[PDB]
Structures are given as structure tokens and as C-alpha cells.
From a paper:
We determined the cryo-EM structures of the full-length AtGORK (AtGORKFL, residues 1–820) in an autoinhibited state, along with two ANK-truncated versions (AtGORK623, residues 1–623; AtGORK510, residues 1–510). For the truncated AtGORK510 and AtGORK623, cryo-EM maps at 3.4 Å and 3.2 Å resolution, respectively, were obtained. Both maps showed high-quality density in their transmembrane domain, allowing accurate modeling, while the flexible cytosolic domains remained unmodeled due to their invisibility. Removing the KHA domain while retaining the intact ANK domain in AtGORK (Δ737–820, residues 1–736) led to a slight increase in oocytes currents, whereas deleting the last three C-terminal ANK repeats (Δ624–820, residues 1–623) significantly enhanced current amplitude—reaching 13.3-fold that of the full-length channel at +70 mV. Structural reconstructions of AtGORK623 and AtGORK510 resolved only the TMD portion, with their cytoplasmic regions remaining unresolved due to their intrinsic flexibility. While the absence of density in these regions limits direct visualization of cytoplasmic symmetry, it likely reflects increased structural mobility upon ANK truncation, supporting the conclusion that ANK removal disrupts autoinhibitory interactions and converts GORK into an activatable state. Firstly, the structures of AtGORK623 and AtGORK510 are highly similar, with a root-mean-square deviation (RMSD) of approximately 0.48 Å for their superimposed tetramers. Importantly, the ANK-truncated protomers exhibit strict C4 symmetry, with RMSDs of approximately 0.16 Å/256 superimposed Cα. A comparison of protomers A and B in both AtGORKFL1 and AtGORK623 reveals that the protomers in AtGORK623 closely resemble protomer A in AtGORKFL1, rather than protomer B. This suggests that ANK dimerization results in C2 symmetry in the full-length AtGORKFL1, whereas ANK truncation restores C4 symmetry in the AtGORK623.
Residue numbers in the entry:
A (entry chain C), B (entry chain B), C (entry chain A), D (entry chain D): 58 to 313
Write the structure that this text describes.
Amino acid sequence: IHPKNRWYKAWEMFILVWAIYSSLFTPMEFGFFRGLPERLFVLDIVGQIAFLVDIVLQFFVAYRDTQTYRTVYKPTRIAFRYLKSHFLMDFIGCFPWDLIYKASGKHELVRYLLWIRLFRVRKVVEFFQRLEKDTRINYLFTRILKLLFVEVYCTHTAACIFYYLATTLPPENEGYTWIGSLKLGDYSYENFREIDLWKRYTTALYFAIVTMATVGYGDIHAVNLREMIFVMIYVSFDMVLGAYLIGNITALIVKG
Amino acid sequence: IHPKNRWYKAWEMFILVWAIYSSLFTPMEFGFFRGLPERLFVLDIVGQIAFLVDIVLQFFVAYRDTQTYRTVYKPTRIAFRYLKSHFLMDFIGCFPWDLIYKASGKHELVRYLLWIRLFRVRKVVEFFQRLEKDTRINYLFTRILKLLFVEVYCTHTAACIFYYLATTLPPENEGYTWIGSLKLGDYSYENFREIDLWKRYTTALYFAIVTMATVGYGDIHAVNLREMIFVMIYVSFDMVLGAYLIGNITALIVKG
Amino acid sequence: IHPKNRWYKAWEMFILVWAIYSSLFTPMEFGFFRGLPERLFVLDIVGQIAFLVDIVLQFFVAYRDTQTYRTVYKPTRIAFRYLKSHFLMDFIGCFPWDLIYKASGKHELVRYLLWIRLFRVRKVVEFFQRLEKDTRINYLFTRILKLLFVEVYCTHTAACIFYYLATTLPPENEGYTWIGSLKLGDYSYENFREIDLWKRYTTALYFAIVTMATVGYGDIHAVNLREMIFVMIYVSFDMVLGAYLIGNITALIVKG
Amino acid sequence: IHPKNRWYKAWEMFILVWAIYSSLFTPMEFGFFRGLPERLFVLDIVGQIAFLVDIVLQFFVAYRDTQTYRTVYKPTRIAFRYLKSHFLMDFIGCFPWDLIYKASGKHELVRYLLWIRLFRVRKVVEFFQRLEKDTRINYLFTRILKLLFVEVYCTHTAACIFYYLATTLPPENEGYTWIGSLKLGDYSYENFREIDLWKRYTTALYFAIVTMATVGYGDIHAVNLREMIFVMIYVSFDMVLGAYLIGNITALIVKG
Ligand SMILES: [K+]
Ligand SMILES: [K+]
């Protein structure tokens, strides 16, 4: 269909909302939750069918050729472009993956793969690129907004992994972990696997946002080797991200 | 009355001092104090009548039209301008609000409303923009001064809220709070509701200025969920504020 | 004498070295030491007579007028300049001030005044100006070097005051202090007034350089109200200093 | 031999890998290891003969004269260039130094000399300069990459020294040290000289990466005087390195 189709824009925004949800919830699902409770099952079904329908619509939509100004309309050409660009990855990240893990003898390697659903963030960067090409905004403000969104997103998906790393150890050796050795005030996170989900998520995101901003109170810190190797990796990338953010903001201020 | 009235400058500078006081004391009043002691009774009344006199004077004063260079004088449209722009908010933030709370069965929701007095910082930013207009100072130095004042002000108004959040919990569950769990040296902040006001304010502002500068010693930290959700919100905004400040300073140096 | 007197350069560098010593040792003398031991007495005498000889030499030197290019040689005007500019402040900070304190009943207010010797840092500032006007170097590199020297100097003079603030409290109430409540490893700084001078200086400068760089480990922190009010003042100025340093470095890189 | 020799490029890239290994392993060898185990015997010999072969090949390679565009070819002047340039240091840092220490009655001063092998990073900066002159990449991206590599390298070589400083103290006075006084979770680093090599390296690099990024959790900190004097030196240089990195990134962003 014509890219300028007015309902196609509404479909794009709907898919954007679903992609935002599926990129903010996938790291939580791999992390805090293990084998999702039966309540959120319908959410999984709805998301997967919605993204499959998006795949079909992409298969049935016309595109603008990049070599020259030529809005092509031949179905085979768009089919080759889609199949060669990213069609395989999205389809692989479209099968219900929780179901496979829950069926095939609860194997952790299967659950180690819903990370591939992170490819849905391509929709978000697509929207950022579209907003850039709009002349209403400036070249740099789009870059700063994109950089800030990426920093905030990597912070949440780093908090999720940082909590996950606490579940790798057996639940007898829980004292030798970032959570389970925590003692804030008069509250001890002894059996952290049994606390409310939101308490654990807030505790794990506290650590991530007092490091992405380089405050580091030190009330929550890595205790194992896995967690140390993860913290050094996280900070060595957040530093470059923050440097880029500061550089872009300064460039916006200088260009006037 | 003409804007160039020489006593009008004196009135503006006097209202500026009152606005500074009412913007640096409102978060303290919502925070550390609860139902202001009888000693400070007269100060509230004096401030409210002073700001009401400012309101009526703003009603009876000429303005400069923004569409074109016209120093207009006709009262009806100056009245309409005042009414639509900000007349409602200042008047709502002009009623004695401590009195209403102390009368109507000490309801916390009433006390949750003096935050509306923060609109008086409009006078401060008005002065900053006026100094921006003056050719005595540069375009960027005004921006750096404004950004530094906003950072320092939000730090104090964040310290006040951070202390307040420790008073939401009942005073039996006092050991699970940012304060009351503190132990500095050989001094334990056990009954923090009973310590001298200035000790509590200094302790709470210490935390705010060792996070606004991103030092984070870690001797004072969030312990509850409210306090964590507040610290993550505070740092995620102070980071952007500091990035903007650094960018503006760098731009001033570059264009220098 | 002629400003281009070749031995006058040697005298200027000699005075510069003495100014370095007297600006890096005055805060230590006000701080860690109280009523200097008899050993360093000759050092005090030599320093004061050296600066008095500098006073008389500057009284007996010619200058170049600032209103226009006029190397004036008339004694009355060259005397009037130094009389009105800084003769008083350089001379009050030239009397032996330790002797007065040790004589007049060991009064602390007298010892609270050798801070006036810090005006000798204007010699270092003038040296930086001399390096600036020289075309051998760039305009910005001089600024970055000056900024880095000021940052490092204020760090040492902040460490000295931070240790001094620990001596204001009586030596019974010593546990309620940043030092005396310290416990690093298995070493407890119990009687901190009796430890070796260099241990105390290194401990106090550790804190200053892990805050001037905004690291803040948190092993050393303010415990009283004096120390908190001092730390908030120190960080709120080191932040601006670091922002200025980063801006100047970025400007040098950009203009390069 | 003509510098444009195609096998000479392969030899240069091979010596580059060896230089990477010898610059990332020398600080570890001076640090964590003391008198390398017999297993790693062959690696040292292979490296030293490889660098000796590089030295003789440099003695038998043609070079480009810097005064004018002249690809000289006469062996005497290439020999003079080598001898006057950095050749003695390469030879001194080519003798097996572990062997000398293990033979000459295990004297620590001999082991204090393999630091001279750090001159091999000259090959890495040679490659960075070659990449700079290649027009494929920009002038600033080369500088940012070089700055980031230097920061990351100095962080590892600072972690190695920070662990080494823990071995200077006798193993009875082990509690008064940054490691050996550590207590992370329920694991106490009591006999730190007996833990696995990789645990100690990760623990010491954790500290270095959470200070090079200025996070400073405070779970690992200096306890002695040696370690404090080292931390103040490390931070006062990492700050300038980070400022330079931010400035270069900002200059790249502004340059468009
Ligand atoms: K920090
Ligand atoms: K800390």
C-alpha cells in the first residue's frame, strides 16, 4: 500500500505502542519473572498475534527505493527487501517462547532467548528517525532525545539483568549476592525470591539509576564475580553514553 | 501606570525579595514544619497581604502589547490580560492555607496544596529575563546564572521533600526511613521528629547537595520504596540539569 | 628600577618560590599545627624577612602606566600605586602572627588571621599572567593550567580546614567527628590529635581529592553540623570549578 | 627494506598483537604474580625472542627521512636513527627479567624493573597514528579512540599496582589493607594471597573501573597510607583524562 496511507500511520503508531511495551517488558520477563504466571498468558497471545499481523502488513506494503527517487510498487521486489532486511529475526522473535520453555522440560537455554524480542526497538528508532526528518524539529534535539531514551532504556534492561544474576546462584547460597545480603534500615532481603515483584524491581532499578547517573551511594553493590564483571561492563558503556549525551547537548547550545 | 514608573522598580524589587522568601520557605513549611508554630503567625499574614497588594497593583498597571510595539493604556484589555495569563493561580496561592488546614480537622490534603505558592518563582525568572534584556551582561551568562539558581533551588526543594517522605510513615515504623535509621559517629537520629529544626534541615540538605553534585558519599541513602522512587526521579533530572549547565558554560567559553 | 632588569627576574622567581611555600604551608599551619613547634621558628623568621625585603624592593621599583604606554620613573606616583593597591594587605600578613598568638595568652582569634597570608598567591596569579602574555603559549592552555592549579590548591586548603573543623570540638566529644570516628581496616583513629602529622594530613587530603574529583567513596564523611555545612559549601564550588575546567578544555579542543 | 613491503605490514600487525599481550600482561606479572609459575616459562622466552627478532628487523629496515620527502636507503644512517631513537630501552626491556630475579637471590629491586617493558605500547600508538593519517577515518575519531584505549589501559595497570600495594605489607599485618580487610556478602578475603588469581584480578579491577568512571561505590577503598597516596594520584589523572575525552567527543559532535 502507499506509504502515505492515513490509516497506515495509525497502524504504525499502534505498533509503536506495542513495541514500547514489548521492549520494556521483555527484560523483566527474562529477569524477575521465571515462567510467567497464568494471568499474563492472554497478554502474550495478544502481543504475538499483533506482531504477526504487523509482519503480514509489512509483507503487504509498498516502499521507496533508496538508490534513486522511485516509489516502487512491484510485490516481488518488496518481498525480497523484507526477506533480506530483518524479516527472519522478527519472525524468530515472534513464536511464543515462554510456552516452549514451559513445555520442553523447563530448560533455561530456551528462556535465554526471548532476548531476541529486543529487535522490536527498531520501531522506536524508526520513529526517532521520522521525527528527525520532520523539519519541525532540529537535527540535534532529535539526537539528544534519542540518546536520553537509549540511556534510560539501557538502565532498565541493566537493572533487569542485575536482578537476574542474583537468581543464577542456588537459593542456599543467597547471602553471597547483591540482593539477599542487602540490609536497608531494619528490613533484610533474606528470601528475596519471595518478596513482592515491585519491591524487587524498584530495588534493582535504584542501583541502576544511581550508577547510570554516576552517583553510586554504595548501599547496593556487586558481591560476586558475575555481578562485578557485569558492573564493570555496565559502567564502561554508560560512561561513553553520558559523554555522548553531554557532547550533543553542548553542540546544541553552541550552534544556537 | 507607565512601566517606566521609577517607584514601580522599587515595588518590583521589593516583591522580588518577598518572592525569594516565599519560594525558599514554602517547601520548608510543607516539609519540616507541620502546622506552623504560633510564633510565625504574623509572617504568613504579612506575606499574604503583601502579595494581595501586588495582585491589585498588577490589576491597576499598564502593560506593553506583544503583537507590535504599542505601550497600551486602556484598562479593559489590561484586565483581560491579567485574568487569562496567571491571575487565578496566584490568587489561589494567596489564601492563608495553614489556617484552613488547622481549622478543617487537620486534613493532610489541605496541607498538600501550599505547593501552589511555588508560582511566585515567576518573579525570579522575570528578573532573570529582564537582566537578559540588558546589554550590560551577555546572552549566555544570564543562562548560566539562571541554570545555577534553578539547580540550587531544586536542591533545597528536593531536600525538603526528602525529609517529608520520612514523616509519612508512622512514628513506630521509624527505623525504616532515610533518617531515624541514621547513625553518624556516636549520634543516633532516633526520634528525628523531636530534634532541632536546623539539625534536620542541614542533614536533609547534605544529602541533596551530595547528590546534586553527584558525589554520593553513601552515609545517607534511601531505605524505603517511596524514598527510592524519589531518589531515582531526582537524579534523572539533576543529571539533565547538570548537562545543560556544563553545555552552557562550554558555549560561553567557546564564543568568548 | 627598570622592569626589564635581568636580576629582577631572578628576584621575581625567588619570590614566586617563597610564595608557593607560604601559600601551601599557611593553611597547614592554621590547621594541623597549633602553635608551631620551636623547630620551624627560623623558617618563620626567614619567610617574614624575605617578604619584607620584597616589600621594600617593590617600593623601590618602577612600573608601566596602564592608561597609556608610559614607563613612568617618577618615585611619588610609583609609590602611590602600591600604597593604594595592596600595601596594607601584604604588610598585615607580614608580621609574625604565630608569635603574637603565643604571647597574648594563646587567643584563638589571633590564630584565626594568618589566613591573610593567602594574598601571596597573587604572585602565582601574576606569573600565570606573564606566561599568558608570552606568545610561546596559547590563550586557552594558560587558562586550563591556571584552573587546574586553582582546583588542586583549593583542594589542599579545603583538606586543611576540614581537619581543623575536627579540632573545634573538645577532645572528650571526639567520637562525634569525621576523624576520631574513623575506622579504616583494623586501625582506629582514636586519639587523632596524637597521631603523626603526615598520617593526619594524608587522611584529610584523601577526603578532599575523592570529592574534588567527585568520587566520594564514603569511607570518610562529615558527621557534625559544621562539617556538613562545610562539605556542602566545598562541593557547590568544586562543581563550578570542574565545569569551568571541562569547558575550557573543550574550547581548546574545538578551537584547535 | 622498502616500508611498503607487503609482508612488512603482516609483520607489523603480528608485532602489534605481541605488543598488546606484553603491555596487558606486564603489569599483571609485576603485580598479582610474584616469580611466575613454571607453567608460563615458555611464553616469556617466545615473547623475548620475538621482540629481539623485531629489533634486528628494525636494524635491517629502510625508513623515511623527516626533514624532507626522501625515502633514504643507506644502512649507516638507519642504524644511527635506530640507536639515537628508542632502541636501548627496547633491548633493556628484552632481557628475561624474571630469570634474573629468580637467580639473583629473589631481590625485589630486580622485579621492580619489568615495568620497562611498557615501552612496547609504542607500537599501539604507532598504529593509532597510522590510522590517523589514513583518510578513511577522521582526525577526531582517532583521538577519541586513542583516549578511550589509554583510559582503559591505565585503569588495568592501576588495578595491578593497587593489588601490588597490598603485598608490600607483611602477611601478618594483612587486616590493615584494602584487600584482606574486605568483607563482601558472606565471603571474607582473609588469606588474599591464597585465593584464585582471577578472583583477585576481578576484585582489583572492579575498584579501578568504579573510580575511572567516578562511581565510587565505597565497598572497596584505600586503608593504608600507600593506598591513599596512590588513589589520590590515580584520581587526579583520571579526571584530566576524562575531561580530555569529553572535550574530544564534544569537538567531534560540534565539528559536524
Ligand atoms: K560519585
Ligand atoms: K559511596
